[PDB]
Amino acid sequence: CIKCDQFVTDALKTFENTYLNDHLPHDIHKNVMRMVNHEVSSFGVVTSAEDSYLGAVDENTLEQATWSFLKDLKRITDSDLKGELFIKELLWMLRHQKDIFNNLARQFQKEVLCPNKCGVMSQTLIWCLKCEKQLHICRKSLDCGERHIEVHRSEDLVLDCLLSWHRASKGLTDYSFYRVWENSSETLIAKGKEPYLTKSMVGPEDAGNYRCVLDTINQGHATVIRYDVTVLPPK
């Protein structure tokens, strides 16, 4: 994906126009750049199989890969290498950075990509072949499950609808909280950016069922959690 990044293509222009002069005779510059561009353009190419993980990463991972690449490219131009030794180390550096990119992509795939265990998460990916940015949808069943909540009369009732991946999901709008009556109809009792609902001084009338619905701009609901609330007598 690093060919997609302006910093990389700016750096490669400077590499060719300014720094190669210091390391190589002019009449090998253009073919050396063909080697460099070829290597760089292959980052994240998939060859079917089990390396589809290579094909897209999020913007943070691209950024890490870009800066890793820039550091190693500068190391090369700052070096005292010339001639064949320079070319050899340049190619090895590009192969090494490709491995680093692959390790970053594998880490992204394992820990960061679609970490939700329920609900629908949206993530922003850069696709490495043609540099397209796209919203990726991680779709699982919307209902995340049911909380059993007990609260003593006259204490505060708090319903929490925050999941760990909500902060990273894209396009979220509001959390709606509903009271779900015994005839199964429901009443909207809060709606806004707050991932929780507070009801002060609960009484027996607050006992029953509630539901949170987290919505998105255009990808449908992202989370539902249900709450079964018992109001206990005072201690």
Ligand X SMILES: C[C@@H]1O[C@@H](O)[C@@H](O)[C@H](O)[C@@H]1O
| Among candidate residues 58, 87, 227, the one with its CA nearest the CA of residue 159 | 227
How many residues touch ligand X (CB under 6 A)?
A: 3
181 or 196: whose CB is closer to ligand X? 181
Q: Does 181 bind ligand NAG (CB under 6 A)?
A: yes
Pick the closest to residue 124 from 101, 108, 104, 107 (CA basis). 108
Which of Ca ion, ligand X, ligand NAG, none lies near 84, with the C-beta cut-off 5 to 8 A by kind?
A: Ca ion
In the bound state with ligand X, the residue whose beta carbon lies nearer, of 48 and 183, is: 183
Smallest separation (angstroms) from Ca ion to the CB of 4: 14
Q: Does 164 help bind ligand NAG (rule: CB under 6 A)?
A: no
Min separation Cβ 94 and Ca ion, Å: 19
By a kind-dependent CB cut-off of 5 to 8 A, residue 218 interacts, out of ligand X, ligand NAG, Ca ion, none, with: none
Residues with Cβ < 8 Å from 90, sequence gap 6 or more? Answer: 32, 35, 36, 76
H/E stretch holding 144 reads strand 143-152
Handedness of CA 78, 82, 85, 90 (dihedral sign): positive
Which of 6, 164, 183, 218 is close enough to bind ligand NAG by CB under 6 A? Answer: 183
CB 209, min distance to ligand NAG, A:
11
Q: Please, what is the minimum distance in Å from the beta carbon of residue 197 to ligand X? A: 19
Give the ranges where the chain is alpha helix by DSSP (H): 6-14, 29-41, 59-78, 83-107
Contacted by 187, from ligand NAG, ligand X, Ca ion, none: CB < 5 to 8 Å by type? ligand NAG
Tokens of 159: 């319903």
Distance CA 33, CA 19 (A): 12
Tell which positions 168-187 bind ligand X, by CB under 6 A: 181-183
How many CB atoms are closer than 10 A to CB 120?
20
Q: Among 5-13, 37-45, 125-133, 183-191, which window interacts with ligand NAG (CB under 6 A)?
A: 183-191
Contact 105, 44 (CB under 8 A): yes
Say if residues 171 and 120 touch (Cβ distance below 8 Å): no
Residues that bind ligand X (CB under 6 A): 181-183
Residues that bind ligand NAG (CB under 6 A): 181, 183, 185, 187
